[PDB]
Amino acid sequence: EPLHSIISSTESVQGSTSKHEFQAETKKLLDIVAREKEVFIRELISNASDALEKLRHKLVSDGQALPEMEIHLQTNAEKGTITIQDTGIGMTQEELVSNGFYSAFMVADRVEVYSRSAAPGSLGYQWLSDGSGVFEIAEASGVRTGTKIIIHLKSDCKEFSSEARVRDVVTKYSNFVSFPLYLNGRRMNTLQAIWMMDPKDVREWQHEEFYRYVAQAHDKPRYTLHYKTDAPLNIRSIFYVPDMKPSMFDVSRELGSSVALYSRKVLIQTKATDILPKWLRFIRGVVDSEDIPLSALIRKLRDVLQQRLIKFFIDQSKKDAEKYAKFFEDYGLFMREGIVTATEQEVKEDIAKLLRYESSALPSGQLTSLSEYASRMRIYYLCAPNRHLAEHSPYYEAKDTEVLFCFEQFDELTLLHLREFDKKKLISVE
Ligand SMILES: CN(C)c1ncnc2nc[nH]c12
């Protein structure tokens, strides 16, 4: 039996507990906090992961051996309890007094905590609170290094004492936790949050495996962007462009982005809706940012990613012009839609930087960007069925001025919405 559990009633308190008042703010908080509810598992697992990370980081800095670093969850139906224990850095009495965590009171009639700091010669402490105006602290024996939280669920939340209900919660939210997580002695997590890895270390087989998981697809990604940054915000993200052509569902999908939102390897909202501009909904991948509450002021992240993705495609066109040509053929509609739907001029020009057209100066079949046309001028366009019809259209013959050639009616409406590029106005020949 490969059952591995570490949770047991080893703690004991010798003397009585001292009673403490909750700060003015905290007391108000515990009431608002206790008004869905299942997210507390997410919060507690994330807290345990942080605790384990601090200890592991400290032990490596001191070149000391690493102990068992695990997160364990236990459910007890007879006692109506849910317990989470980690073998992390723990807490001292000072940190325990000051003491995310209070999300436990969403479902708890009373909370019971045992913690022992990893520092040598530390003591175990017991922390008790019913979510009222008083909590209790006392020295405890038999407290394992790390932290143990025992939640006595109120009758309205007894479901969280069932292994089936908790297992569904853990799998949905905490699938990518970086430390081994156990539920009633059974290992749960096996997926790797590859977006946290060093971009140059991720192997092609990992990107393909992850793309198929996030996109629920069976093809491969033709483009992969591993974007990590901390200057504006904290961003750990990977974006994939499917190898397939866009599907009728992709072009007509409403209120979806096909991008997962994460915070510290913990899920925030699967199929995040407003993480990317709607015209980038054909993108698959994940966005991880610790600067997320847990739904108004996210736009700053959306604009940063739009610019980064637009830069990525501009670079892709320069690295391989032929691969980008078919990408434009397959996904150009999204870019024209993004311009038609844009409201500010600077975004329209940025997206338009991705658009490709044919030119009278270049041979049939060769593409050119609006910037390359602007570079060579000493912006005029003509929309016609095809190239030969364009050269023979009366509008074109009428000074060694080069003219861009569009073929679709959306191209014209796109250029019509994009009045100007780089302060050069767009004027149709005919
Ligand atoms: C809740 N909180 C602030 C914590 N501090 C340190 N180690 C912990 N292990 C689980 N929760 C912990």
Ligand SMILES: [Ca+2]
């Ligand atoms: Ca994976």
